[PDB]
Amino acid sequence: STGSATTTPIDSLDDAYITPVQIGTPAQTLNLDFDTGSSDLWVFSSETTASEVDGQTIYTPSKSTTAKLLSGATWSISYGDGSSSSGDVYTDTVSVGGLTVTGQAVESAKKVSSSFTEDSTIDGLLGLAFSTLNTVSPTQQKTFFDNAKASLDSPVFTADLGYHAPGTYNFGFIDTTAYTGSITYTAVSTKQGFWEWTSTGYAVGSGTFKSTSIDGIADTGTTLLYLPATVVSAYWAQVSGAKSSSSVGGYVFPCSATLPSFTFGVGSARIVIPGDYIDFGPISTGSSSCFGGIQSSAGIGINIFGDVALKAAFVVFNGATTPTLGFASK
Numbered sequence: 001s002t003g004s005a006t007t008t009p010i011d012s013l014d015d016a017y018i019t020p021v022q023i024g025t026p027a028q029t030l031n032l033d034f035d036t037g038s039s040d041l042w043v044f045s046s047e048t049t050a051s052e053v054d055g056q057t058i059y060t061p062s063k064s065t066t067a068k069l070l071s072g073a074t075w076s077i078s079y080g081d082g083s084s085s086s087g088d089v090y091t092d093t094v095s096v097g098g099l100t101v102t103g104q105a106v107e108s109a110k111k112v113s114s115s116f117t118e119d120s121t122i123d124g125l126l127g128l129a130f131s132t133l134n135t136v137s138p139t140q141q142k143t144f145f146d147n148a149k150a151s152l153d154s155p156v157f158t159a160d161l162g163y164h165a166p167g168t169y170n171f172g173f174i175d176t177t178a179y180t181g182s183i184t185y186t187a188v189s190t191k192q193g194f195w196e197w198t199s200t201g202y203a204v205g206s207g208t209f210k211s212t213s214i215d216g217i218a219d220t221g222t223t224l225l226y227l228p229a230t231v232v233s234a235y236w237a238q239v240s241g242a243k244s245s246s247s248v249g250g251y252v253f254p255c256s257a258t259l260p261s262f263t264f265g266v267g268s269a270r271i272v273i274p275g276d277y278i279d280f281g282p283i284s285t286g287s288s289s290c291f292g293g294i295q296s297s298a299g300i301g302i303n304i305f306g307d308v309a310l311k312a313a314f315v316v317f318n319g320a321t322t323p324t325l326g327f328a329s330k
C-alpha cells in the first residue's frame with residue numbers, strides 16, 4: 001500500500017504545516033502537525049478541558065464505531081518549546097492520504113498547554129520519530145508509520161515541505177518526479193529515538209564550504225534551523241545590523257536586509273537554503289526588526305534541522321531494518 005497527503009503551512013511564515021488525517025468510523029478529519037521529532041499521535045478531543053479548546057476541531061471517540069478505550073493507558077508529553085499535553089488513549093482506525101491503519105493508538109488530550117489552545121489551526125500532532133519515544137504508559141504504543149510499515153510497498157515516508165506553499169507527505173514510495181538530481185543517503189542513529197544524522201559542513205552565501213561534522217536531527221515539527229553557536233555567528237556576521245537579542249530570544253536582523261543563503265552538507269552533496277527562507281518577519285507587528293530562521297542550539301543540547309532546512313530538500317525517512325535519511329534538491 002501507499003498513501004499521499006498534501007501538507008499546508010498554517011500561516012504566511014510557514015510556522016508549521018498541517019496535514020488532514022481521518023480518524024474513526026465514520027471518519028472525523030483533523031488537521032495534524034506531522035512531527036518527525038516526536039512519537040505520539042495526540043488530538044484535541046471531546047475530553048479536552050473546555051476552556052483549553054479555542055477553535056480546534058475535536059475527535060469524539062463516542063461517535064466512532066471503531067474506537068475502543070485502551071484501558072488504563074495514559075500519556076503525557078513535553079516539547080522543546082515548553083508546551084505540553086496529556087490524557088488517555090483510544091485505539092481507532094486512522095487514514096492518511098488513502099493509507100489506513102487499524103488499531104492505531106489515538107491519544108486523546110484531557111489537558112493542553114496555552115500555546116496549543118492559542119493555535120486554532122493545529123488539531124493535534126502525528127509523531128513520526130521512533131516508537132521508543134512514545135509516552136504512553138504502562139504499555140508504550142507504536143507510531144502510525146511503525147504500524148503501517150509492513151503493509152507499505154517500501155518501508156519509507158517522504159517529506160516535501162513547501163516554501164510559502166503546500167507540499168506533500170508520501171508513505172510507501174519515493175516520487176521520482178518530486179526532486180532534481182539524485183538522493184544522497186546518510187546514516188542515522190536511533191539511540192536517542194530521533195532521525196539523528198551528521199551533516200558534513202556548511203557554507204554561508206557564496207562563501208567557501210567548511211568541512212565539519214554537525215550531529216543533529218531531522219525534525220519536521222520544529223520551525224527553525226538550530227545549529228552550534230560558531231556556525232550561527234558566522235552566518236549572521238554576513239548580515240549588516242544583525243545581532244543576538246536576549247530580550248527577543250535569538251538573532252534578529254533589519255527587515256530591510258537581503259539575507260544570504262545557507263548551505264549544509266549531506267555526504268558529498270549540498271542542500272542550499274535560499275536567504276528568503278531564513279526570514280521570519282517582524283518580531284512584533286509593525287516592527288522593523290525581523291526574526292532570524294537560523295538560531296543557536298547552545299541552550300538545547302542538540303542541533304535541529306527543522307523546517308527551514310527540510311523545506312529546501314526532498315527528504316526520505318527510510319525505515320528499513322537499518323534506518324537512513326535521504327536528501328535531494330528540488
Ligand SMILES: NCc1cccc(N)c1
Pocket residue numbers: 016033035037038079080081083115116122125221222
Ligand atoms: N515540536 C513539536 C510541536 C509542534 C507544534 C506545536 C508545538 N507547541 C510543539
